[PDB]
Design a protein around this ligand. Sequence first.
Ligand SMILES: OC[C@H]1O[C@H](O[C@H]2[C@H](O)[C@@H](O)[C@@H](O)O[C@@H]2CO)[C@H](O)[C@@H](O)[C@@H]1O
Ligand SMILES: OC[C@H]1O[C@H](O[C@H]2[C@H](O)[C@@H](O)[C@@H](O)O[C@@H]2CO)[C@H](O)[C@@H](O)[C@@H]1O
Ligand SMILES: OC[C@H]1O[C@H](O[C@H]2[C@H](O)[C@@H](O)[C@@H](O)O[C@@H]2CO)[C@H](O)[C@@H](O)[C@@H]1O
Ligand SMILES: OC[C@H]1O[C@H](O[C@H]2[C@H](O)[C@@H](O)[C@H](O)O[C@@H]2CO)[C@H](O)[C@@H](O)[C@@H]1O
Ligand SMILES: [Ca+2]
Length: 516
Amino acid sequence: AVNGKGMNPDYKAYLMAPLKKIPEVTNWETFENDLRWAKQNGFYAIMVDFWWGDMEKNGDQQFDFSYAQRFAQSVKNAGMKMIPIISTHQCGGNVGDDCNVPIPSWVWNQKSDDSLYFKSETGTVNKETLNPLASDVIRKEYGELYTAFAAAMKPYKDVIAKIELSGGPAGELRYPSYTTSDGTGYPSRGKFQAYTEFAKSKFRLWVLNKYGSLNEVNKAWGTKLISELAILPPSDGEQFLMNGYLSMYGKDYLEWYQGILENHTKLIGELAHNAFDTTFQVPIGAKIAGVHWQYNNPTIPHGAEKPAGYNDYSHLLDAFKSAKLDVNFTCLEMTDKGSYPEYSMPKTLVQNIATLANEKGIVLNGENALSIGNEEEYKRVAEMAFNYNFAGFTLLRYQDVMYNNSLMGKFKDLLGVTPVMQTIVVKNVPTTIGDTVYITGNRAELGSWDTKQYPIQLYYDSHSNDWRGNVVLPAERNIEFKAFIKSKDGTVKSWQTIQQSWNPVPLKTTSHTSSW
Ligand SMILES: OC[C@H]1O[C@H](O[C@H]2[C@H](O)[C@@H](O)[C@@H](O)O[C@@H]2CO)[C@H](O)[C@@H](O)[C@@H]1O
Ligand SMILES: OC[C@H]1O[C@H](O[C@H]2[C@H](O)[C@@H](O)[C@@H](O)O[C@@H]2CO)[C@H](O)[C@@H](O)[C@@H]1O
Ligand SMILES: OC[C@H]1O[C@H](O[C@H]2[C@H](O)[C@@H](O)[C@@H](O)O[C@@H]2CO)[C@H](O)[C@@H](O)[C@@H]1O
Ligand SMILES: OC[C@H]1O[C@H](O[C@H]2[C@H](O)[C@@H](O)[C@H](O)O[C@@H]2CO)[C@H](O)[C@@H](O)[C@@H]1O
Ligand SMILES: [Ca+2]
């Protein structure tokens, strides 16, 4: 893996449940059998949406966790684990959505202003999820929902492996900047979503709080604003994305804009921890979308990410570390293109997020953005997952492998692996002062024969005079590998004479000794 390390010893594969409730797909008996089958193919747990629209449909404090409870019961009967996603967003309307579960209708009556929803550059209103600006309403509702959920699911604490929170549209921490109705669907530029009166008002106050008075504002922005009312979000999102973002106004606007999501992250992280830490004691995470289009567009750089709220990923991730939330990213199955007209760079994006997350020490999880119908995509996921220290991978979605045996088989081999620590020993290596020995092999967990970025470093043993090291490997899979020497300058000097192999890697920890 990167930095001479191996794969993450805690890696686990999860299966995304269907969008429709199980009873709308099959019966519980078959479901339990499907779970037992998934478990046999390497899946540790099933991740599932529990919609707010279902749990608190009738009215405030009128909860119904019966479906959730019945679901967990079958997961228990099947000896599986589950990861509930407390989906406080709407189901249906997004790409590939085969459902219709809007959030409780009554929640909208809690305000007379336009503080609860979103409004785009061109006036399009969106109600897929509560506007994170309404932190007072969010604190109350999420707070009550989370605590009610914890109590209702207490009997199933043993089958809950982790809990995922919904931070916005499609359960992702972002603004609803790419939608059909707003004319911003992939792969077009996104539209800023801060045009409600309430949003304008908050930005205005934030600016004034930062500089004190209009005069200081004008001084900092180098503008000639006539009055406080002239402080507004961009009038033209396209011109703003073309070069306005470069000005001091631009930087302030984007800071505030992304800042709303960061504060939201801290808020739900606090509520979640207060509600679950004692009862469940399981990790809590949230999702970051993979807005890969318009990434390298020369005219409107990062023209899709910025409107979505993603301007500075480093700063964004700090909010996660701060809230004590693990991160779940996507687009692990895609490769870079970067050509007109999509200017898509998903892999570069993933590499960047992973690196940042690793540096900050944030537990990293991932998913595939679109359905995978070919083995090649599994390899892409494997390459990313096993070389950038991912702790978990969730496959979307259930039916794709559950009803396709050959596909399910390719996943078991490539992704449904169980990491096991093994000792690799290499004798008689003709190393000279300055050299270091690494191993690289055929599987992604071994760098896929890469000597540049992913080789796994070994350590010299001055007592037995050989090179060794404890490496994490995929249990019960066949591997081939060879050690090689790297110069002080990083040049590959030579390779082990004969290619080694382990068919397969044993399930118990032991050692593989070979000679140069
Ligand atoms: O709030 C000040 C001003 O902001 C916007 O104008 C920006 C523009 O969006 C940027 O692209 C760049 O040109 O800087 C401008 C500010 O000098 C709003 O369009 C405008 O209505 C508002 O007064
Ligand atoms: O639903 C949010 C979702 O949006 C994106 O998915 C894209 C997909 O990558 C494109 O190929 C095309 O199908 O449009 C989809 C929706 O616009 C992100 O890739 C994904 O990370 C994000 O969760
Ligand atoms: O291209 C990857 C390749 O790596 C190994 O082959 C080495 C070989 O062991 C060295 O003696 C020398 O020939 O460099 C080769 C790499 O170009 C693996 O043995 C091979 O299976 C793998 O495809
Ligand atoms: O059930 C999980 C969520 O699935 C959809 O959202 C996915 C989307 O299908 C995928 O293309 C994107 O890359 O990731 C999101 C987030 O997992 C539904 O639209 C969501 O409502 C569900 O929560
Ligand atoms: Ca409530």
